Structures are given as structure tokens and as C-alpha cells.
Design an enzyme around this catalytic site. Structure first.
Site, PDB file in Angstrom:
ATOM      1  N   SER D 145      70.805  30.242  73.056  1.00  0.00           N
ATOM      2  CA  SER D 145      71.238  30.695  71.739  1.00  0.00           C
ATOM      3  C   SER D 145      70.024  30.857  70.848  1.00  0.00           C
ATOM      4  O   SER D 145      68.950  30.346  71.159  1.00  0.00           O
ATOM      5  CB  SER D 145      72.166  29.636  71.123  1.00  0.00           C
ATOM      6  OG  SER D 145      72.386  29.857  69.734  1.00  0.00           O
ATOM      7  N   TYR D 158      74.594  20.809  69.109  1.00  0.00           N
ATOM      8  CA  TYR D 158      74.442  22.109  69.748  1.00  0.00           C
ATOM      9  C   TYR D 158      72.968  22.513  69.769  1.00  0.00           C
ATOM     10  O   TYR D 158      72.442  22.930  70.806  1.00  0.00           O
ATOM     11  CB  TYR D 158      75.250  23.163  68.992  1.00  0.00           C
ATOM     12  CG  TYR D 158      75.246  24.515  69.666  1.00  0.00           C
ATOM     13  CD1 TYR D 158      76.185  24.829  70.651  1.00  0.00           C
ATOM     14  CD2 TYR D 158      74.300  25.480  69.319  1.00  0.00           C
ATOM     15  CE1 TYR D 158      76.185  26.080  71.275  1.00  0.00           C
ATOM     16  CE2 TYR D 158      74.287  26.731  69.937  1.00  0.00           C
ATOM     17  CZ  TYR D 158      75.233  27.022  70.910  1.00  0.00           C
ATOM     18  OH  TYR D 158      75.225  28.262  71.507  1.00  0.00           O
TER      19      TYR D 158
HETATM   20  N1  LIG Z   1      79.412  34.000  70.934  1.00  0.00           N
HETATM   21  C1  LIG Z   1      78.216  33.857  70.357  1.00  0.00           C
HETATM   22  O1  LIG Z   1      77.977  34.427  69.282  1.00  0.00           O
HETATM   23  C2  LIG Z   1      77.132  33.043  70.928  1.00  0.00           C
HETATM   24  C3  LIG Z   1      75.766  32.918  70.293  1.00  0.00           C
HETATM   25  C4  LIG Z   1      74.847  32.044  71.060  1.00  0.00           C
HETATM   26  C5  LIG Z   1      75.139  31.421  72.183  1.00  0.00           C
HETATM   27  N2  LIG Z   1      76.408  31.528  72.807  1.00  0.00           N
HETATM   28  C6  LIG Z   1      76.626  30.800  74.046  1.00  0.00           C
HETATM   29  O2  LIG Z   1      77.100  31.674  75.025  1.00  0.00           O
HETATM   30  C7  LIG Z   1      78.032  30.994  75.907  1.00  0.00           C
HETATM   31  C8  LIG Z   1      79.267  31.853  75.849  1.00  0.00           C
HETATM   32  O3  LIG Z   1      79.851  31.710  74.548  1.00  0.00           O
HETATM   33  P1  LIG Z   1      81.128  32.575  74.231  1.00  0.00           P
HETATM   34  O4  LIG Z   1      81.021  33.208  72.918  1.00  0.00           O
HETATM   35  O5  LIG Z   1      81.616  33.482  75.307  1.00  0.00           O
HETATM   36  O6  LIG Z   1      82.220  31.379  74.055  1.00  0.00           O
HETATM   37  P2  LIG Z   1      83.546  31.082  74.785  1.00  0.00           P
HETATM   38  O7  LIG Z   1      84.119  29.836  74.218  1.00  0.00           O
HETATM   39  O8  LIG Z   1      84.440  32.266  74.795  1.00  0.00           O
HETATM   40  O9  LIG Z   1      83.017  30.876  76.290  1.00  0.00           O
HETATM   41  C9  LIG Z   1      82.643  29.568  76.755  1.00  0.00           C
HETATM   42  C10 LIG Z   1      83.452  29.282  77.995  1.00  0.00           C
HETATM   43  O10 LIG Z   1      83.050  27.968  78.421  1.00  0.00           O
HETATM   44  C11 LIG Z   1      84.167  27.380  78.991  1.00  0.00           C
HETATM   45  N3  LIG Z   1      83.913  25.954  79.090  1.00  0.00           N
HETATM   46  C12 LIG Z   1      83.699  25.068  78.075  1.00  0.00           C
HETATM   47  N4  LIG Z   1      83.509  23.823  78.489  1.00  0.00           N
HETATM   48  C13 LIG Z   1      83.607  23.915  79.863  1.00  0.00           C
HETATM   49  C14 LIG Z   1      83.505  22.940  80.871  1.00  0.00           C
HETATM   50  N5  LIG Z   1      83.281  21.656  80.690  1.00  0.00           N
HETATM   51  N6  LIG Z   1      83.653  23.354  82.172  1.00  0.00           N
HETATM   52  C15 LIG Z   1      83.890  24.687  82.387  1.00  0.00           C
HETATM   53  N7  LIG Z   1      84.007  25.677  81.529  1.00  0.00           N
HETATM   54  C16 LIG Z   1      83.853  25.222  80.258  1.00  0.00           C
HETATM   55  C17 LIG Z   1      85.274  27.754  78.032  1.00  0.00           C
HETATM   56  O11 LIG Z   1      86.607  27.570  78.560  1.00  0.00           O
HETATM   57  C18 LIG Z   1      84.958  29.216  77.737  1.00  0.00           C
HETATM   58  O12 LIG Z   1      85.621  30.192  78.547  1.00  0.00           O
HETATM   59  C19 LIG Z   1      78.111  29.561  75.367  1.00  0.00           C
HETATM   60  O13 LIG Z   1      77.203  28.723  76.106  1.00  0.00           O
HETATM   61  C20 LIG Z   1      77.661  29.725  73.922  1.00  0.00           C
HETATM   62  O14 LIG Z   1      77.112  28.493  73.413  1.00  0.00           O
HETATM   63  C21 LIG Z   1      77.396  32.337  72.212  1.00  0.00           C
END
Ligand SMILES: NC(=O)c1ccc[n+]([C@@H]2O[C@H](COP(=O)([O-])OP(=O)(O)OC[C@H]3O[C@@H](n4cnc5c(N)ncnc54)[C@H](O)[C@@H]3O)[C@@H](O)[C@H]2O)c1
Ligand SMILES: NC(=O)c1ccc[n+]([C@@H]2O[C@H](COP(=O)([O-])OP(=O)(O)OC[C@H]3O[C@@H](n4cnc5c(N)ncnc54)[C@H](O)[C@@H]3O)[C@@H](O)[C@H]2O)c1
Ligand SMILES: NC(=O)c1ccc[n+]([C@@H]2O[C@H](COP(=O)([O-])OP(=O)(O)OC[C@H]3O[C@@H](n4cnc5c(N)ncnc54)[C@H](O)[C@@H]3O)[C@@H](O)[C@H]2O)c1
Ligand SMILES: NC(=O)c1ccc[n+]([C@@H]2O[C@H](COP(=O)([O-])OP(=O)(O)OC[C@H]3O[C@@H](n4cnc5c(N)ncnc54)[C@H](O)[C@@H]3O)[C@@H](O)[C@H]2O)c1
EC number: 1.1.1.47
Lengths: 261, 261, 261, 261
Positions: D145, D158
Site C-alpha cells: 500500500s 495497518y
Molecule cells: N482498495 C484499496 O484502495 C487499497 C489500497 C492499498 C492497499 N490495498 C491492499 O490490497 C489488498 C486488496 O484490497 P481490496 O481493496 O481488494 O480489499 P478486499 O477487502 O476487497 O480484499 C481483501 C480480501 O482479503 C480477504 N481476506 C481477509 N482476511 C483473510 C484471511 N485471514 N484469510 C483469507 N482471506 C482473507 C477478504 O475476504 C477479501 O476478499 C489488501 O491487502 C489491501 O490492504 C488496497
């Protein structure tokens, strides 16, 4: 040296040995009241206490495992109960052990993360909670390493814990800056402490480590204690969220000397 | 405060005003011998000399434009001729002016690069040349900015000059570390000096700048002079190649407070 | 590979040899129209032009010294006059020479700063000026080095020029992001080009350089051209202000492998 | 787009939604064999499988909680058992929740550290163990991130988890570079996924977030999937240990636009 440190209450985790011990003695010399911390028995702690009495300092030793929440809470409360307040919190406890990353057990990984990162979070949390509830412009100093920047094969858990500490410190610094609470990291390079006694005992290993230090020498604990004393003082009043590296140039990429590459 | 600074000879470029002036006074208070530098207005220099005399310090003022090689060479030689040696070289002279990047003339770009970067290179070169030829473990302190890290639209020349200064300092630190010569950068945030007098005079602009400082206040010159004094002292014996930011948290991304984004 | 690059006009400075030449050929293969640049005579340039004709590409060669303002202005105008527009500007020209820092002449320092930094500023300025005046969401790619991060003794001018380039790029990226203009740096490690032909010819020197590369091999120009093609494409639509290092791990501190230190 | 991805086996944790889902679909389009992962809700997984079938891709869904060691081990083994090999491991699962740091419970802190950091360590460990034991030059991509760099008040857990991920990735990259195993981080800024659906639904909040993005728009999942596809391809053959930020300029300090400060 720093007149403003007189009477300040300083708590240092893992201060019965190494850098923690040196900082405890330095702060005592600055006339601050010190709270020493030991994990199991007070033997090593009594050594530090006598060193502090020798310079005419005032201090107490409190037992506490930084991986145990109630122990960290008690450590902070003990300082307030004994000296009436808390001014500086120094999260220094830490551990490390070498293991190829693909062979590292979850147990070893957790032990280092729990102690090095989570332990520092707990200490920071409790100190800041106190600072905020009592409108005290205190400071938190977290002991990091050149490895919050320099990757470390065989110590992936340690590197991750310090990289995490960096962002934790910067986040806390930003979050509490409006309240006058400063949070900074100290990033030591290779320092002469018990954690490296055996390693530096071997002439071949010492020479190897010294070859990675541009200044050419392994630092002494006092050189790190000097940094902690300054950061805690009002001289560093406008300094927050940084990592002050005291590494003899280690983070400057030692392999590139003499215009190599 | 720092006993080891007594008798040390310190040269500071652009020290007739602002941060340079504050550092000159601080070093004089530490009983160091100071060489003040003015570009053209000698009256401003005499003013600093008066403040130094007020604290019982010893100093001289030397005319010199840091963009003129012979002037920089003469500045260093003047210190040696007057006080017999040189211990600390501080490259502080600098300038800035706002212009949209795509509209910036080569003339404006060069003026800032020549003064801020090349001027510091010349000062560093001459001080180090002297240190090396006389086996002196001296130190060079380069005045940078939070903008060696934080981009600065409208000041692309300034940002480039400080980003360049960062790598220059780290390179010199690595290159001369074996000789005990320390080279460090100080990175001030928004400080109350004449360069920002008009800007901070306007209540709307001041409030705007303060909103970008987590600690909530514009720093004072003395808070930066404190950093310079410490870095020059033996307390920072194992510190080299770093940039010590004194910015009230500016480099910690002020727009992300309160968990925004 | 990247369908969106077809028909795009790409200008690359110093593209008659090395990385510039490889990028010119790669973009031609992506069906982009290329403007090659040579400093003195068109001989080396004609080699690249024939390579481009061979893959069925379209290109022209324009003479121009990046340290001469009128030459840079003419270079950009020539692309617009010949192909009707400009889409990608790549500042790749550069030079380096080893000299101990305290012995480096102002002449050598200026030559490298003028070419590596100021030359890139001029190219960026002219391309962006055009993009802004014609509402074109163009992109500027600046050729940096692992040395915008890794200090480089004996090449203090080069390190300063790239450290400066980093802040220049980040500043331009922030300044023009609202207009959809992306500005990024590519940071190559040790690559097999004519600038290192002699150095890598010697078996002892090659082995020395390879020991500083974690992946164990000196990269090929095509591996850098691949990065330039991707950054110029719409695949990297949300990427701006970064430095994409393609260095086989050089910036990860090679001396710390095997848990040393 | 990337011919070398055809037939490659890609495992993506937390791929039943958001970025994970988009990457699964993108890799399927590149003709790679994909292993989708769901924590508990299988219906969400079947949805992604349907999208993959829509593009003529081949994939399977495997249940697994990344905080459970045996689940991560089984996830990797399932890919090998079903498709005969493993080529790309993408640790994408993650979670976040806002809480003032001094009020954050150890429980909340651990949940985020365990999932975001330790979960990625386990996934990386298992993939690399397989790569090493079978002499496969595979790659690991860790979803980070902008907050492995930008501090994040209210999300200290985080920020710490991603800062830790950065050093973990750089360490693994250095440690396994000699074996041809590349390890890289992708650093997304604000992206339109379910994790931000409610936040971006509110016009006031969306405008607030957009004001922190220099490019002026919230990115789409496909823009991140594009980065993952490129990093996994042979086009990025000489790239390892980096964090490729795709953030519309967020890490360039948005508050400093227009020459403020
Ligand atoms: N969306 C954003 O703007 C953004 C910005 C920076 C970083 N990220 C990172 O990108 C990744 C994807 O984020 P996203 O937006 O798709 O969020 P999201 O919540 O849609 O996707 C995260 C997925 O992780 C799964 N998950 C959580 N805990 C788990 C566990 N213990 N075991 C298995 N699966 C588990 C959830 O069910 C979910 O489908 C994350 O690591 C997030 O921190 C996202
Ligand atoms: N010595 C160096 O060269 C060096 C370089 C970089 C960073 N550091 C860091 O500085 C700190 C001090 O290191 P040091 O050299 O003095 O090592 P040390 O082992 O002598 O000191 C660490 C102390 O932590 C204590 N400790 C460990 N786990 C604990 C727990 N759960 N609860 C309470 N106390 C606990 C130990 O008993 C010990 O006294 C550590 O955080 C270390 O990672 C040291
Ligand atoms: N004031 C701030 O908030 C701030 C923040 C970051 C960095 N800085 C840096 O700190 C230094 C001090 O800034 P300041 O606020 O005191 O500004 P200032 O303008 O008061 O001081 C700069 C001095 O440089 C001198 N100077 C300029 N060009 C010169 C030349 N060619 N030869 C000799 N002297 C020359 C000026 O006459 C002046 O006295 C500068 O390098 C500046 O970029 C200041
Ligand atoms: N080769 C590497 O390993 C490596 C590593 C990092 C960075 N770089 C950078 O990549 C770029 C390409 O390097 P390269 O290896 O192809 O070297 P190169 O010498 O083959 O290419 C540089 C080109 O710049 C041209 N040039 C120099 N000064 C000029 C001027 N004033 N006006 C116009 N053209 C001018 C030269 O004639 C030459 O063709 C340079 O900026 C270099 O610093 C190269």
C-alpha cells in the site's frame, strides 16, 4: 549536559544490559529519574542500579515481559507511582536469531515480531495514553536498527519488525504531533554489546563486520546513549517522526566505496 | 553545552542573516571561533559580529559569493589564516523563487542550482581538501530542506538542488568516512527567518503553512541552530551521511492526519 | 505488445547508442514513430535508423546537444513538424567520469550537472510546455540510475545529478498530475552498454561488478527498454512520480547477503 | 499481452473480491492457470470462477484462512496437485479498521498484523520453499500500500504491517536473488473496491479522497491488475525487491501542490 532532563522520569525496556543499560546510566548522569526493566530476575538489573547510585542517580527496577500486556501496563504505572509522572518512554527490548527464510518456523517469526514490534507498540500505546490523558508533552523513543532500511537475509523477522517499527513511529508522530508528543526512532549500526560479544570475539568475524562500516570501527554503547539523551532533550524540540541513524555510515552502501560498480 | 566545541573553528556561508546568523551565534556561545560570511552587504555582517561580541565570542566576517570558486577558496583560507585551522564547514547559503516549471527560464534554474548545489559542493570540496591534506577529522554540515524529500511545485530548481545535495552529502560521507570526516545534512521545515517574513506576515498564509505542520507551529532559528551544534559535537561521533529533519513532522505527510484517504 | 503505443511519437535524447538506441528500437517495434538524437555526426545515428527500418519502423534523426537550450527546443519542434505531435519524451543523454571528490574540478562537476540534470530539465520543460499548451496527456520518462539512491564515491557529480533528477521528476509529477501528464524515472543498475564495454571486458572488473548484483548478472539493454515501453503505455495509467529500479537487486544492499553484519 | 504467462500457475490469496478478483481475471486473460482463494464465503469465489470461464480461462477455488499455517501450506500444495506446478504467488489478503492508536486493543492490532504481515510471510515462505526445492525461478508479488511509506493515523496497525511487508519483501528479494526468484511489492493508492464502497459512496468523502490524489481520480482495480501482470512477466526480468507504487501521485505529498509551504 541537558539541563532540561533534570527531574524527568525515563522508563527504558530491556535496560538491564547493553544499549538499555548504557542509556539508563546516561540519563542518570543527566539527573533524570530512571525506571530500569528486567525480564526474569533482578541480578542483571542490580548491576545497573549500582552504577546509577554511583553517579548519584535515582532509579528503581521493575520486572516485566514486553510481550505480556499487563506487564507493560504495570511498568508504566510503576513509574508514575514511584516518581509521580512519566516524561520519556524508551522501547528498547528486542531479540534476533538467524534462520533461512524458507526454513523459518512460525514460532520463531512470532517471537521476534511479538517482542520487537508488538512490544514497542504496547509501550508506546501506554505512554501516549498517559501523555494524552494528562496533557503532558512527553516523548517516545523507539530503538530500531539500520535494518529498518537495510534488508537482512537470515533475519527476515527482525527486518520486518523494524520496518514495521518505522511506520509505527512515523504514524504515532503524525497522529500526536498536535499534542506536542514527539516520537522518534534511533537506528544503531553495529554496536559493542552482549548481543554481539561472541560474534566480535572471533577476529575473522569482527574484521568482516568492520569491513561493512565506512568509519571503520564498531560503535560503543555510549555513542548510542548520546543520541537518546539529545532526542529526549528540548534541544530536539522541533524533531519528530525521524529515524536518526548512528551507524558509522552503514546505510550508505559500503560495497560502493572506491567508485566500484 | 558541548565542551568539545570550545576552540573549534567554524565557517558558515550566508551567515549574516537567518539560520546562518543563528548558528553563528550558537557556536559562539559554545566558545567556538566563527567565520561569518556575507555576499555583499557588510552592514548585515557587522550586526552578527555585534551579537557574537555580546556573548563574549570571537569572530571575523569574510566577503564571498559561493558561486565564485576563488571566493570559496579564499573563505576557507581566511579561516585558517586568522584562526590557524578549520574544524567545521557549514554550507548554508541558498536562494529560491517561485515559477511554474514549464515557464522557468534557464537563467533562474541555473542561479538556484549554482548557489544551492554547486556552492555547497565547492565549500565541501575545499573543507575536505584541507581536512585530508592535514589529517584533520573535521566535519561538513550542509543545510538542506524538507524538500530534498518533499517535491515542490513552482520550485523545481530548489527541489532538484536539495535532492542533489542529499546524494552529494551521502557520497562525500561514504568517500571520506575512513578518514574520520563526517558529512551530514540538516533538513529544516518551515522556519521563522527573513526568507519567509512577508509570507508569514499575512495571517492567511501563516495559517496555511501552519496547517501543513503536524506540531502546529513554525519553528524558530534557534531550534535549527541546536541541531547544527549537536551534529558538530563529539556527541554525534558515530553519525555520518544522514539528513536530520527538524520539521515539526512535515515529512510525515500532513494531509493524512485523522486517518484520511 | 502495447497496442496503445502504435502511432505515438517518441523522442529520445542520446539515442544513437546504448540504452537510448535499444529503447528507440523497442518503441519502433511497438509501431511508435521515433525521433533519434545524436550530438555530433549522424554516423552512429544511421545505424539505429537502419535497425528501425529493418523492423518496419518509421524514424528520423535530429542533431542536438542537450546542454544547448536552442538545440533542445529544436529537438522537440522537429518531432512535431515531422510527425505532427509529441507523446513521449525520454531524457536519456548522460555522461560520467571518475575523480576523487576533493580533487574534482568545477569544470568536470559542471559538465556532468549540465548534461545529466539540466539537460533533462530542459527536455522535460519543453515537452511539458507543449503538452500543457495543447491539452495532451503526454508522458516524460527520465533515465536515472541506482545512483539517485546509492552514493557513488569518485562520481559525486553523477550522484548529485541523479539525486537532483529524482526530485525534479517527483516535482514535475506532482505539479502536472492534474493535467494527466505522467513523469517517471527508470533506475538502471549495471547494464551492458558501450559506457561499460572496457570495464566489463576485464575479467577481474566484470567479476567485481557481478558480485555487487544479487541476481548475479549484468543486465542487457533490452531489459531496460522493456521498462520504458511499459511506463509509456496505458498499462501504467495510474503510475506517476516513481523511480522504477531495474537493477537485479543492487539497491537492496548486496554486502548484507548471508546475514552478514 | 504477455506470451510468457501462458500456462503459468498463479495463486492469489483473498481473490474472491476486489483487487484479488481483478488480478485473477487479468491473469486468466493472459492464459495463466489461476488458483482463487476464499476465506469462508464460497459463493463469492464461484462468482470469480464464472468470470474466468467467461474469458476461456482455467481456475479452481481453494478455501483457506491466511492466518492458519496449515491452510496456507494446503493452498500452495493444492495448486501443485491440480496444475502440477506453481509459478507466481500473490499475497493479497488483508484487512483494516480505524482506531485511535492510544485506544487500540491488542486484539485489533494482532488481527491486522497476523493477516497483513504474517499471512504474507507464510505465503511467501511456502512458495519460496517450493521454488528452492524444485529449482524453479518463480516470483512472489506482495500486495502492499502507499502506507508502507505514508504514515496512517487511526491505522497504526495497518501502516506497521505494510512497513513490515516492505522489509520482508526486500529481504526475501536479496536472499533469493541468486536463485532467480524475484520478490516485489505493489503499492496501490486509493482504488475502487468493496473495501472503500461505502466511503466513496458519500460525495463528501469521495471528494475528500480525490483531493489527496494529484491525478484527480480514484483508480480502478484493472489499473492495479495491469501492474501485477507486468511484474509477473519476463518483461520485468531484471526487477526485484522494489515497491511499484500505482497511486496517481499520492506518495508525492499532495498538500504541497501550487508551491505551498
Ligand atoms: N482498495 C484499496 O484502495 C487499497 C489500497 C492499498 C492497499 N490495498 C491492499 O490490497 C489488498 C486488496 O484490497 P481490496 O481493496 O481488494 O480489499 P478486499 O477487502 O476487497 O480484499 C481483501 C480480501 O482479503 C480477504 N481476506 C481477509 N482476511 C483473510 C484471511 N485471514 N484469510 C483469507 N482471506 C482473507 C477478504 O475476504 C477479501 O476478499 C489488501 O491487502 C489491501 O490492504 C488496497
Ligand atoms: N547491539 C547492536 O549492535 C544493535 C544494532 C541495532 C539495533 N539494536 C537494538 O537495540 C536494542 C538493544 O540491543 P542490545 O544490543 O543492547 O541487546 P541486548 O540483548 O543486550 O538487549 C536487549 C534486552 O532486551 C531484553 N528483552 C528481550 N526480550 C524481552 C521481553 N520480552 N521482555 C523484556 N525484556 C526483553 C533482554 O533481556 C535484553 O536485556 C534491541 O532492540 C536491538 O534490536 C542493537
Ligand atoms: N527558512 C526556512 O524555512 C528554510 C527551510 C528549509 C531550508 N532552508 C535553507 O536554509 C538556508 C538558510 O535559509 P534562511 O531562511 O536563513 O534564508 P536567508 O535568505 O535568510 O539566508 C540565506 C543567506 O544566503 C546568502 N546567500 C545567497 N546567495 C549567496 C551567494 N551566492 N553567496 C553568498 N551568500 C549567499 C543570503 O545573502 C542570505 O544571508 C538556505 O540554504 C535555505 O534554502 C531554510
Ligand atoms: N549503462 C548503464 O549501466 C547505466 C546505469 C545507470 C544509468 N545509466 C544512464 O542511462 C543513460 C544511457 O547510458 P548508456 O549506457 O546508454 O550510455 P551511453 O554513453 O552509450 O549513452 C549516452 C548517450 O548520451 C549522449 N550524450 C552525452 N552528452 C550529450 C549531450 N550533451 N547532448 C546530446 N547527447 C549527449 C552520448 O553521445 C551517448 O550516445 C545515461 O543517462 C546513463 O547515465 C546507464
Amino acid at each position: 549536559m541537558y539541563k532540561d532532563l533534570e527531574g524527568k522520569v525515563v522508563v527504558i525496556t530491556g535496560s538491564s544490559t547493553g544499549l538499555g543499560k548504557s542509556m539508563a546510566i546516561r540519563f542518570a548522569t543527566e539527573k533524570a529519574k530512571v525506571v530500569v526493566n528486567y525480564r526474569s530476575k533482578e541480578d542483571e538489573a542490580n548491576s545497573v542500579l549500582e552504577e546509577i547510585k554511583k553517579v548519584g542517580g535515582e532509579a528503581i527496577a521493575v520486572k516485566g515481559d514486553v510481550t505480556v500486556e499487563s506487564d507493560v501496563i504495570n511498568l508504566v504505572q510503576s513509574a508514575i507511582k514511584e516518581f509521580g509522572k512519566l516524561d520519556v518512554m524508551i522501547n528498547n527490548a528486542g531479540l534476533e536469531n538467524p534462520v533461512s527464510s524458507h526454513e523459518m518456523s512460525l514460532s520463531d517469526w512470532n517471537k521476534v515480531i511479538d517482542t520487537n514490534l508488538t512490544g514497542a507498540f504496547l509501550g508506546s500505546r501506554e505512554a501516549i495514553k498517559y501523555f494524552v490523558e494528562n496533557d503532558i508533552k512527553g516523548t517516545v523513543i523507539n530503538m530500531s536498527s539500520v535494518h529498518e532500511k537495510i534488508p537482512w537475509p537470515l533475519f527476515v523477522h527482525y527486518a520486518a519488525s523494524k520496518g514495521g517499527m518505522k511506520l509505527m513511529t512515523e504514524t504515532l508522530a503524525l497522529e500526536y504531533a498536535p499534542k506536542g508528543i514527539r516520537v522518534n526512532n534511533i537506528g544503531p549500526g553495529a554496536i559493542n554489546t552482549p548481543i554481539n560479544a561472541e560474534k566480535f570475539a572471533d577476529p575473522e568475524q569482527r574484521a568482516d563486520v568492520e569491513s561493512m562500516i565506512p568509519m571503520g570501527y564498531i560503535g560503543e554503547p555510549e555513542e548510542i546513549a548520546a543520541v537518546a539523551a539529545w532526542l529526549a532533550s528540548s534541544e530536539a524540540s522541533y524533531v519528530t517522526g525521524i529515524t536518526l541513524f548512528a551507524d558509522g555510515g552503514m546505510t550508505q552502501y559500503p560495497s560502493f566505496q572506491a567508485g566500484r560498480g
